[PDB]
Amino acid sequence: ELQEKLIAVNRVSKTVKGGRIFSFTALTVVGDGNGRVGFGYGKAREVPAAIQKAMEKARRNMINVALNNGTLQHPVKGVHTGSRVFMQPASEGTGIIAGGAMRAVLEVAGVHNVLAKAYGSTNPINVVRATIDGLENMNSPEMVAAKRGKSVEEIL
RNA sequence: AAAUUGAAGAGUUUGAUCAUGGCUCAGAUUGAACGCUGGCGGCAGGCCUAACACAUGCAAGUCGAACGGUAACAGGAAGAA
């Protein structure tokens, strides 16, 4: 049911008395092709075990993003430690205009038409954190209407 | 009624990480040049540098319905053999 994407796999290291110990880290994202998406970061000595840990961590701690019919609902910007990210809704059939980790997380998150841009450092972990941060605090018309106590027609 | 519809990043500092920060690349474009190769057509373009020097040909003439005139043609009138 859920679609899982592997974003970046790199080899981290650790020096001990014996010498260098090489470990692997796996950044993956999972989602239901709709408002549910979540990212996982796993680490192990082998890449299959790393990707498996990442998928288990990704399937938990997911969030609900109040998205439109196929796009976002307003231009929103997010930040997490090095990646000022900005994204806005686009018309039908323009695709996912995004780079690196952003493309994978958006695609799995179900949006199909979006203009995005990554400022600052484009580190994959930080941008996928910042992207879901912006998505998490993205207001919806019903939420803002109920929040301010007015009708959705009054706010349009 | 339409007159807009619009935004991708990656490699590289470290044993490994994050940030700052420079270099490099993927794209589009030209009055272009060079290297290899080369079939046809349509529409454009062609001294960016020495505003350095120019042989030769052409690139401003027209009007006899402004005027004296006949230098040539070509006809007439007087003729002449």
Q: What does the H/E/C string look like for A29-61?
A: EEECCCCEEEEEEEEECCHHHHHHHHHHHHHCC
Distance CA A12, CA A45 (A): 10
Task: Label residue A34 left, alpha or beta by phi (over 0 means left) and psi (-120 to 50 means alpha).
Answer: beta
Using the structure, give the distance in angstroms from the CA atom of A55 to the C1' atom of B73, rounded to a whole number.
Answer: 111
Which of A105, A108, A97 is closest to A133 using CA atoms? A105
Q: How far is it, in rounded angstroms, from Cα A146 to Cα A151?
A: 8
In whole angstroms, how far apart are CA A13 and each of A22, A41, A143?
A: 4, 16, 46
Give the nucleotide with minimal C1' distance to the Cα of A13.
B16
Cα dihedral value A101, A52, A109, A147, nearest 10: -110
SS3 state at A85 = strand
* Neighbour order of strands in the sheet with A36-44: A3-15, A20-31, A36-44, A63-64
Helices A124-136 and A101-108 pack at an angle, to 10 degrees, of 40
Distance of A107 CA from B71 C1′ (whole Å): 99
Q: Which of A85, A99, A96 is nearest to A129 (CA)?
A: A85
Q: Which nucleotides in chain B have some atom under 7 angstroms from a protein Cβ?
A: 5-10, 15-20
Integer distance in angstroms from CA A126 to C1' B64? 99
Q: Distance between CA A122 and CA A3 in Å, rounded?
A: 24
Task: List residue ranges whose Cβ is under 7 angstroms from nucleic strand B.
Answer: A 10, 12-15, 20, 75, 81-83, 86, 88-92, 94, 97-103, 113, 115-118, 120-126
CA of A14 to C1' of B66 (A): 112
Angle at A72 between CA A67 and CA A75, to 5 degrees: 135
State whether the Cα torsion A12-A81-A65-A108 is positive or negative: negative
